[PDB]
Structures are given as structure tokens and as C-alpha cells.
Design a protein around this ligand. Sequence first.
Ligand code: COA
Lengths: 342, 342
Amino acid sequence: MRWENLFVSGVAAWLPPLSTAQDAVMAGLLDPARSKLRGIESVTVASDAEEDAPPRMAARAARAALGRGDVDPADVSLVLHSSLWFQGIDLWPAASYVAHEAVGRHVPAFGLAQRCNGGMGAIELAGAYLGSGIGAGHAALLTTGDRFAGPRIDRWNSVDVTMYGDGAAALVLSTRDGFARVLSTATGVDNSLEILARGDEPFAPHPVEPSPVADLGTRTVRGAELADLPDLTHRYIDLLVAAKTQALEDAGTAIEDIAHAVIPVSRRGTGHELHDLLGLPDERTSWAYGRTTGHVGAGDQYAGLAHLVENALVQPGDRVLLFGGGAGYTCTAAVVEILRMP
Amino acid sequence: MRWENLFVSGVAAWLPPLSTAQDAVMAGLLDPARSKLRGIESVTVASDAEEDAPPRMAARAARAALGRGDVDPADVSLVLHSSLWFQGIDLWPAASYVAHEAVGRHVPAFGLAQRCNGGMGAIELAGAYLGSGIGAGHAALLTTGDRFAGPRIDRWNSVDVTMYGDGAAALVLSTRDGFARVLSTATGVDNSLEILARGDEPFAPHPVEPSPVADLGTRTVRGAELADLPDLTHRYIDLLVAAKTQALEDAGTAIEDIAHAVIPVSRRGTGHELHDLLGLPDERTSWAYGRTTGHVGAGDQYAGLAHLVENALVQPGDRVLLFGGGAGYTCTAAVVEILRMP
Ligand SMILES: *SCCNC(=O)CCNC(=O)[C@H](O)C(C)(C)COP(=O)(O)OP(=O)(O)OC[C@H]1O[C@@H](n2cnc3c(N)ncnc32)[C@H](O)[C@@H]1OP(=O)(O)O
């Protein structure tokens, strides 16, 4: 999709303090071989206090993003809140709380689930909503927020390719103006790969209690065994290449003209990484940042973009690729152009 | 929102067998006074078999609805799966499963959370998406699915105003054509009421285990206390009346020209009921049906419209009000004109 009139108005993260892989190793929580392989130096870890519940961190990130963009909350016509895990209270609309605390009473709010790709997928859904004429305001607030805790989640081991960081991020879209223009978005998807996110886990009538520690790495292997697909790895590669090619093509931009790519925090640690598929070096991705925060739920792309802008690592005229990807498997990519610095 | 080119192509519900309130009374699960007051005659109840997990019930409803509209799955550009509760397997994209099984590999799929309003809210989000140019296809598949189970959920008592039913529904939208035309949608919202859905439940770092039985009636009472607003009931009434008024006038339709209203399954039992606020009699709403299914997660409106169409209880030219409402609080309403009978 080529967007004629869509902008990023503001972007911000609220992240708790850093917790080092070195301390995790010394506490016996993380095998040193694994620490070295995955290359994550630290992840962000929140206290267990109510004030650090995901919807409260999201509310803080949202207020920072709206303030930095100078967007009036009364001009926000939609709130989308994406997440991976528990928001702190069940049977309750976390999205309406985020909306209420950051924007106000009379804005439609949805919770959005597209696993790790939620932040990026939200941009397409919101962009469409803003162009439709359904609501009066010109802006949409997109938030993410998670806070991982045991027993269910072991942030250091529960996923093979990454380590979870706690925190929230926010991005404000506008059809009027912003510091960056969204030139394009594009989604590659292959829903056959959903089996890798459940493995051989049975469908249970109720959440299994007490919660065993999650092991999504073992799910992918039971999943691969079960699927019996000849081209499993090719399916992943193809959907990622389609998102990239179409986002770039619809933006009229080549990969050589991408100043920086903001990517999911994940790492194989040997062989080809995502940057090799994208066709650009490691230093032109957000990895140097991402490896200090870990995988902050659905917010890596918003957080990484905030990092670029806050540290003046881009200037007007640069184009940036925001690149998604999440279990499903769904990948939404976007090309943005820096128009001015906040 | 007046819609120039939005149609309903097919609608279906996959419902498990009914279970009577009176059998529940005799089993010591429901107080006789409550069964009489609420007037719910029966509720749908799924088996605990894996084949009745919500996303699987949703896939079958989706297949049924896609067949009734003769929609080629290659023309579906979006799947939105809305739900209230656990989908059977955690940390997994249920929407991608629904999409894969009902439509295919290469359609973007999102999970949606807007409590009981998810089904109706999804119509606006999907309408915008189809109108935007993002996907080539002309149709969106919208599903719902839930299957309630203990200890967390007591279908008979966990919500004071209704009793939960298991099952799934599906609604296929199209910008090209269908058996019904969507003339309008309108959302009223007041996010201050999110507190009623949370009560004084503290934000916990991890799901509380073992799960106690949910009591959402008590959350409302505790929430109202904490909120201490003098006009709480007026806020609720006002957003419902605003949803109603705007839907009706964007469709250029007066209330006495609405043949039927499909409403959420609930009942106070004395005093006014929603039909008084809508300004139409009880027999021109879906209550006679709804009172046999219970509140079927986010799918009451889809199911109620399916019941109308399948039993030829509406004819070409009739206009139907579909009326949402979910904790948040958000209410999305729509006026639909029947163009022909499938
Ligand atoms: S996922 C969906 C979950 N469900 C919800 O989120 C429901 C949210 N709302 C509530 O829980 C509130 O408690 C509401 C419904 C706002 C208030 O309910 P009450 O029944 O406690 O309201 P009051 O007793 O204050 O009623 C006073 C008078 O207000 C009118 N009125 C209230 N509710 C309705 C409805 N549903 N329909 C028509 N009129 C309504 C009545 O005139 C009422 O006087 P009565 O003499 O009781 O009729």
C-alpha cells in the first residue's frame, strides 16, 4: 500500500531499568553458552508493583508520544493496544483503560492480537480507519505493553530465538502532518505457520493451572514434526521477502536508500540473520539497541524508531524501514521518510 | 457513518447443544429465583472435546458463512476474530488458525478484544480496511468464538445480567455485493466505565492461580463505589442512545421502520429493558431467540441475524438494527437492509 496522506506524529517508549545477562548467568537463570549465542546483553525488567502493569506503562508511553507530537488528545479517533501476554486483570478491556488514561472518554479502543507483529499490523488497520471517514479526528494512538512474570514466562529461556523485555511503546499516526511520512506499508503472511506457535499443545477447556513454564522453542519443533512441510524454512523466507519487496516498491525506495531498519529483537547467533535476508549490514539495523532491551512484546519497532529519533541518528531526507514479524506467521513492514526532527 | 458500498455477503453460527436453566436449577447450579428473574430459558454448551475449542467452532461457522455468500476464499483480504476469553492454547495466534482453516495461507488475520462489542466493532474496522486499497480482495471474514469453563467461569452466575453460551459466529462483509446492504454504522463510547469491568481487582504480575470463580456482578458494584460518579447510569444510557440515534439517521431510517433489532442477550427482569431505550417492543427484538442461546461471547449480533435470515423472519426491503454493547464501555450499532434472501 502506498499512502498519500499518512504521517507519524509522535513515538515513545516507557521502559523499566536494564537487567544484565551477566547477572542472569551468575544467578543460574541463564546458561552462559546461550547468553553468548543470542547476543542479548540486557533486557528491561519492571517491578511487580501495580504502577508497572502493562496498561499503565502503555498509558505513560502514550502520553509521551502524544506530547512529543503536539497532538491534542481530543483529535484522536482510535486507540489500538497490542500485546503478547497478561495485562494484569482478566475479563477486562485493557485497551479502554489505556484510552481513558491517555486520550479520554469518547474514543473507540480495541485490544489487538497479532503476536510479535501487532505494533506493525496496527499501523495498517489504523491507517485504513483514519482514511475511511468513520471518525472525526485526524490521529490514531497505537500502543503496546507487556510485563512478563513466572511461573508461565521465563524471560531468559521461554523462546529460543530471543529474550523478553518488559515495557510499553506508543506511536501516533496522523492524516494531517508529523515528523515522518509513512510512504508505504505491506504485509506478508503465511497462516500455515500457526502450527509452529502451538506445537502439539492440546486445546484445553480452561487455562492449565498451575502454569507450567512456557517453552515456545520446543513448540516450534513439535510443530515442524507435525506439519511435515517440505519447504518450511522457505515459507518463512518468502513471506518476509514479500513484505520487504512490496513495502520498498510501494515506497519507490531501494534497500540501498534505507538509512536504518528497525527490526524485531531476535537472533540466531550463527549463519544468516534477518539483516542478511533484508540485504543490509548489522550496523544499519536496530540490533545495537534491541540487544540492550530484549524483545519488548509487540513494541520493538515503535521503541527502535523512538531510539533513532531521540538520539538524532537520522536527519531529514533519510528513509527508515520498520520491519515486523510475528507468530502466525505475519509480517508488516513500513517505509517512513524523515521530514523534520521533533 | 453512512456506507456507500458495504454489504453482508453471508452470516452463520456454529452452536453446540442447548442446556436448560431448569436442568441447571435441578442440578444445584442456578438459584430458582435467579432463573425466574433473568428469564433465560436455555444456554448453548459445548463439549470439552478439542474439536469444540473456540477457534475450531469459529472455522466451521466461517465455512458455513462463506458458502452461503458464494464468496471465493481468494477474495478475502482480512480476517478479524473477536472473543471474550481463552481460546484453548495460550501464546498462540488463534486468528491465524481461523484464517488458515476457513480462508487460507495468505490473508492477514488479527485477534480483536472489545469485550461483548467485538463483533460489531469489527464491522467498522473491516469496512475501513476493505475501502482503503491495502488488499486486492473485496471481502472480510469476521468471526467470534468462545467456550466458557470452570473454575474461572460459571456460565449461570458469573455475570449478573446474563448467562453465557458457548459457540461461534461468522459474518462475511463485501464491498461488491451481498444479500444485505450495510447502510450505516455508529459507535458510542465512554471509557470511564472501564472501571466497572475491573472493580477493585488489583493488577497482578501473573494470572491468579488457582482461578477463583469470576463474579462480574460484584466487580460492577465495587467499581461503581471506587468511581463515585453521580451520573454513572446516565453515561451508560447516553452512549447507547447516541449509538442508536446516529446509526438510524446515517441510514435515513426511523425506528418504526426497523423490522427487527438484534440485541445483546441480557435481562434485568424488572423495570426497563434495552428495548424501552431503543423505543421498540420486545417482540421486534431478538430476545425470544437470545433467551434460548445465552450470551454467545461477542457473537450475539451475528447469530441473531443468522437466525432471522435462516428462518425467513425478514423479507427483502426490511431494515434490521444490529446493536452492540460491551464492557469498556463501547457500543457499535448498524442498520442493515435486506436486498434478497440467500
Ligand atoms: S461485555 C458486556 C458486559 N456488560 C456491561 O458492561 C453492562 C454495563 N452496565 C452496567 O453494568 C451498569 O450497572 C448499568 C447498566 C449502566 C446500570 O445498571 P442498573 O440496572 O444498576 O441501572 P439503575 O438501577 O441505575 O437504573 C436506573 C434507571 O435507569 C434506566 N435504565 C438502566 N439500565 C437500563 C437498560 N439496560 N435499559 C433501559 N433502561 C435502563 C431505567 O429507567 C432504570 O429504572 P428501573 O426502574 O430500574 O427501570
